Amino acid sequence: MTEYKLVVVGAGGVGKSALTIQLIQNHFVEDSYRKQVVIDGETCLLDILDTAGMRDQYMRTGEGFLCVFAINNTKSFEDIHHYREQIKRVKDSEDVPMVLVGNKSDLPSRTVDTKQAQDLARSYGIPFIETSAKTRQRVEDAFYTLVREIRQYRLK
Ligand SMILES: NC1CCN(C2CCN(c3ncc4cc3C(=O)N([C@H]3CC[C@@H](N)CC3)CCCCCN3/C(=N/S4(=O)=O)Sc4c(Cl)ccc(O)c43)CC2)CC1
Ligand SMILES: Nc1nc2c(ncn2[C@@H]2O[C@H](COP(=O)(O)OP(=O)(O)NP(=O)(O)O)[C@@H](O)[C@H]2O)c(=O)[nH]1
Ligand SMILES: [Co+2]
Ligand SMILES: [Co+2]
Numbered sequence: 001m002t003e004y005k006l007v008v009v010g011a012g013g014v015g016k017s018a019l020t021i022q023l024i025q026n027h028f029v030e031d032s033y034r035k036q037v038v039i040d041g042e043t044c045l046l047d048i049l050d051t052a053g054m055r056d057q058y059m060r061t062g063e064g065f066l067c068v069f070a071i072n073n074t075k076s077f078e079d080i081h082h083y084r085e086q087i088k089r090v091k092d093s094e095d096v097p098m099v100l101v102g103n104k105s106d107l108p109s110r111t112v113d114t115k116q117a118q119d120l121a122r123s124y125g126i127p128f129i130e131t132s133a134k135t136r137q138r139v140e141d142a143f144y145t146l147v148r149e150i151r152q153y154r155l156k
């Protein structure tokens with residue numbers, strides 16, 4: 001049974017922990033969690049690390065990264081450059097499985113346009129998904145897309 005190490009990264013308060021607990025407990029609220037899931041007929045064990053805003057070690061061990069910003073926090077969006085740069089430096093590769101996640105999609109105070117984030121994700125060559133840990137909207141899609149990015153990378 002294939003095991004995938006997933007790391008959730010992003011600035012303080014963007015909802016890294018809320019996203020992880022929504023995937024695990026299906027509830028809106030340890031730093032590591034495990035969950036066996038079936039994606040495209042293949043069984044796998046997701047091993048998920050929740051981080052703070054061991055850094056080089058988790059960036060080396062992580063197979064895929066959820067780079068999370070909050071749609072109401074422009075600094076958290078700008079700071080994605082910093083998380084993507086540190087990951088690429090440690091992995092010594094311009095190709096690392098990553099998904100850009102715009103969290104708090106439920107909130108009315110949006111300061112980052114969906115279009116702005118989509119264009120950035122297109123510049124990075126990674127998927128972009130808007131999520132809400134509060135309503136569970138696209139939370140599975142974000143983690144499962146990341147597992148699909150790791151599998152596609154493993155066929156390279
Ligand atoms: N509020 C903050 C509290 C502190 N958290 C940090 C706590 C220390 N962190 C660790 N970072 C990496 C390692 C172990 C620990 C680290 O010492 N821990 C300890 C686990 C037990 C206690 N809560 C103390 C933290 C975090 C769990 C490590 C789980 C195994 N692991 C890894 N082990 S590790 O490389 O030896 S890497 C890894 C990856 Cl990339 C994916 C999935 C994984 O399960 C994984 C990073 C997160 C971040 C959130
Ligand atoms: N409205 C809304 N609030 C959310 C959402 N996700 C998280 N929050 C809230 O945002 C705050 C920070 O969430 P948290 O999960 O702790 O974020 P974090 O990125 O893990 N924080 P830290 O870096 O300190 O560990 C909490 O008040 C949490 O309830 C969401 O999708 N929508
Ligand atoms: Co509760
Ligand atoms: Co830089």
Ligand SMILES: [Mg+2]
Pocket residue numbers: 016017018050051
């Ligand atoms: Mg947290």
